[PDB]
Symmetry: C4
């Protein structure tokens, strides 16, 4: 029945105390008791409680005692509204689900997001080791492998051993060591042997900002990969079956076509849904053609639906990383 | 000729009553009659009508008695403005068509959007039945089908019958039962027979949130599929005709090329507009090459025009579903 | 040196008259002369000029006499700010070029954007005529064309003549008639003859809202087509030359490869830049492979750069058309 | 302990001087000393300091002495807030990294972004020279090159020499001259010889606005090219190795498949990651098929992650160029 005047920095808001006592735990509710005159800045000639805060968002906080819900403005960023919430006693978890995903979310994007002359003296050997690995397989140095290649990689491993004689000698305590510095253990005496020779680049690929952002993205968006894989698996199964039966109705067995099984149809339905189209297997009857024309479009759609959700994350994280790089 | 002072929560707005009587059905219009002093909170010393509401949107409501049109702000969400509209007596259908699609919509996105150990004991059998179906066709277990596969699927159907001896016994009343629990009716005694064996996954594909959002999208956007199909059909017809005639002018019949008919040109014009390109049929004359270079681009455009409209829906619905999942 | 108080609807703005006389043609400038007391609503006890307008944008208008430039807010739509501009005497062409493309935009998107039982009795004949045209070419009804097909199309043309005996008889005056109702002139006595038989669908393709929006888009964005064609032509020329010379350095003539000319390289460079890839012509030397790996990416980029500009137009126009369809 | 009233144009903001002395270098801090009454517009009856500026952003400036951080509003553009910052003494480099990339951003998009009858008399010769170059290679005018083609290009070079007899004669001082007007030096007496004949179009391709915007984009976004190249190189290396070993486990050498080396796998892994798919090399074992189905998706993702960042730049720059073209 009575009115009180919350003067939030020059621009006074009036309300009924019956409105302020809707949520009795927060700070504003304390104003309503007949004791607040002994706690806050009560000017005893205009009866207004001074509160020296941003007056352009407090009219959205107070629009949580008036109606009953709490929304976020669109004229302030996340952290500004969050600081104001934290002040006034409101909880940052009553935000309605419409104004929540565009308010969390810079808070979910923070995400913790002269020996510099031998770093190149290690990168050079990393790259030459990658090259020697990629050339050991070529059937030009295998008339039986030529000796100069194993000599080169011997120099590489005798330098990597030298570098591994400091990361255990001068380190204080006791990921990129056990299953990533394995080729050093290997050369001294092939799939799992030398796949790891190429993994050493993931050691230095943390000093580049773009790959740090990519790594943070590939783990802050780990649901939109299950989603994409499940979409693609459903599509592959459905369209493999459809194309098998379609090609079958088009005239003692299936010897006039490529899709002889439902399994082998998975290869086709995945080189078609992705709009790849090698050309090893394609439809050859009008029913097969209709099913393929359906498959291409369904694939475009079920791939383009979650990939934008994946991509906005990288956009935001990379924008933040560059903004942090371009500021002192 | 007279002025009145609508004090909407501390920040008074003045107007002429001649402005407030533009729409005589709403609440504000009642203020103008020489009786409102007996209805509302009329402070009889400053002559201001108190109205204890958000003062940052009421200056957009009142900007519907001043000009004549009603627009929505961009510093508040949908539901906030909608609640304020509902209060003041304004109708939410006078919104101009520019400020309408970005005001409807969180209202069109709500869209209604220990026996948990046998659910896995049903999913296991669903998956093994899918696998046995996909392996019955392979020409490795058909020297004539091997007996262990029909034995396996017999175990599967004798478990699904057991599970179907409760969904009719203990159910109160009397979609996923008639045309989805058909293989149980089948095995006891092939296209329409066993296509349905794979449909059982659509029973469990409602417990995943991503597929619920996909299902809601595929039906809240059922116009943008007719649109895409019509675009693609027009493109296919036009470019099939163009490529037939083009390949024809390039020198007694058409025995030097692939496009011998206007029908068979549909397959090409749809594996090209989608940027698929198998390679079974391609142009082989300079006029055919120009028409194909036109077809690829027209296809990219007439596919990328409505697909973003389809994709924004999934983006919004999935954002809402995740926000609702991440909040108590 | 003196201050005056523009009371724009309850929320008074103070300024110096020396500020208001920056642009002497507009309305506000009239307030500054020592005569405005005889023109406007001058309350001669608080010395404030009443102006009964939106007080949330006038603080952006007045921020054109203070600094010297004119910007648009982001908390109001286009037409709202435009109406306020039109009132205050400001011109809508002084808007700075940053706040202009997001202010023009609904103004550039307006863009002018029981005989209903014989419309189907014409669409049926249109479709059957399209089908008879597409089947006249097939080498199944050409053992020499079978008589039933020309009989069918004779029925079609004898109905279209009947319908053309009203659009000249009962029309008041004197596009879709001369070069679109040509087959009627044709059958009574082949490229340009019967391409037009398929054009009749563009007569009815104006009653669908999606194709109306597509037609408005394809002409409100006629610069972003010259742009795309020029990008693609530059790319095609550059990469055709590059791939010719590359494939040439890889070891008396060029008889070991596909790219024997710079012209024929255009076909490849356009089925590759569009990520189509038929497979009729591909690189076969390491230099050719590097150039092709460059071509694919340059094509993706120079196609994806203007296509989003093309697509936003359709997005906006279609949103507007649907908003206008969903409102009385 | 004391309060002061910054009247920023009609809408007074109150604060404690203890708040205004948080940053003692800026202008507002001067208000707090017991001398400001002799410097600013101090009305000595309401004790308010007049400051005649936009009152809708100063409540965000002052929200930098209250909390400690500085954010940008979303209801004003970049340059407006920047002008207000510049006024008040605040530095435009304390902006928090969330509100920075959407505040820089028009400032990072400005970026410096009757002889007109012989310009066509040069473009004609440029185009005919391009055509003669592209036709010198064709094996239709090489029965040995026909004389009319070298005659034509002789006319072209004797006109380009004439035009090069003015750009050195009447030019005041002493890029598009040394390595771009080289064919004139060439014809008077082939890879590096005549690649440059096509470079002359880059001389005139600065008079088109679309290509000016493209050129500004291709250099304001030179990090997102290193990023894309590094993503693609990592992908190519990883998936080349994976597909080699996969195809190897699928059953004395590798004579049953295409991927015989890790190098040649780069061609495949780059015509697949880009969703090109020629069809010259594809997987032929189930493990190869799984790895290829992984490669297509990883390629789609690692290409679509930085390309939107590249594309937004062209969008913004082109919008600005068109807005500047459409305004006096
Ligand atoms: C000391 C130092 C300074 C700068 C950088 S660095 O950040 O500038 N930098 C250089 C190369 C890479 C890289 O990760 N290359 C991967 C690759 N491409 C093809 C095969 O492997 C990153 C690293 C170390
Ligand atoms: C009781 C329970 C708990 C969780 C889930 S669940 O939601 O986590 N869940 C699991 C599998 C699927 C699925 O739909 N798989 C489809 C498919 N992929 C390849 C062929 O078929 C969904 C379901 C039930
Ligand atoms: C009287 C009336 C009512 C509705 C419509 S209508 O708007 O609903 N409508 C129907 C078909 C089309 C169309 O344009 N079809 C093109 C096509 N597809 C394949 C070949 O040609 C549009 C038209 C007329
Ligand atoms: C005097 C004047 C006026 C207008 C223009 S102009 O700006 O309108 N203009 C015209 C052609 C181009 C162009 O760059 N063409 C490239 C190309 N396409 C295929 C091969 O090469 C640009 C230029 C000069
Ligand atoms: K493709
Ligand atoms: K392809
Ligand atoms: K392709
Ligand atoms: K292909």
């Amino acid at each position: 029945s009575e009115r009180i005047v919350i003067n939030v920095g020059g621009t006074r808001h009036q309300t009924y105390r019956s409105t302020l006592r809707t949520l009795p735990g927060t700070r504003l509710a304390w104003l309503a008791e007949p004791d607040a005159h002994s706690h806050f800045d009560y000017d005893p000639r205009a009866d207004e409680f001074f509160f020296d805060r941003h007056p352009g968002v407090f009219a959205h906080i107070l629009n949580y005692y008036r109606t009953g819900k709490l929304h976020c403005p669109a004229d302030v960023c996340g952290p500004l509204y969050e600081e104001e919430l934290a002040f006034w006693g409101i909880d940052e978890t009553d935000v309605e689900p419409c104004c929540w995903m565009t308010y969390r979310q810079h808070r979910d994007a923070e995400e913790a997001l002269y020996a510099r002359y031998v770093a190149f003296a290690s990168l050079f050997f990393i790259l030459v080791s990658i090259t020697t690995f990629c050339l050991e397989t070529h059937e030009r140095f295998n008339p039986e492998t030529e000796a100069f290649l194993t000599y080169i990689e011997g120099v590489c491993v005798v330098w990597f051993t030298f570098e591994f004689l400091m990361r255990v000698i001068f380190c204080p305590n006791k990921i990129i060591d056990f299953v990533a510095i394995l080729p050093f253990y290997l050369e001294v005496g092939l799939r799992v042997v030398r796949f790891v020779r190429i993994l050493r680049i993931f050691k230095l690929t943390r000093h580049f900002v773009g790959l740090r952002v990519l790594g943070h993205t590939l783990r802050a968006s780990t649901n939109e990969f299950l989603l994409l894989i499940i979409f693609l698996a459903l599509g592959v199964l459905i369209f493999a079956t459809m194309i098998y039966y379609a090609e079958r109705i088009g005239a003692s067995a299936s010897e006039h076509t490529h899709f002889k099984n439902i399994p082998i149809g998975f290869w086709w339905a995945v080189v078609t849904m992705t709009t790849l189209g090698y050309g090893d297997m394609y439809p050859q009857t009008w029913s097969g053609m209709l099913v393929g024309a359906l498959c291409a479009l369904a694939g475009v759609l079920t791939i383009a639906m979650p990939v934008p959700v994946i991509v906005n994350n990288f956009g935001m994280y990379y924008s933040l990383a560059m903004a942090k790089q371009k500021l002192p």
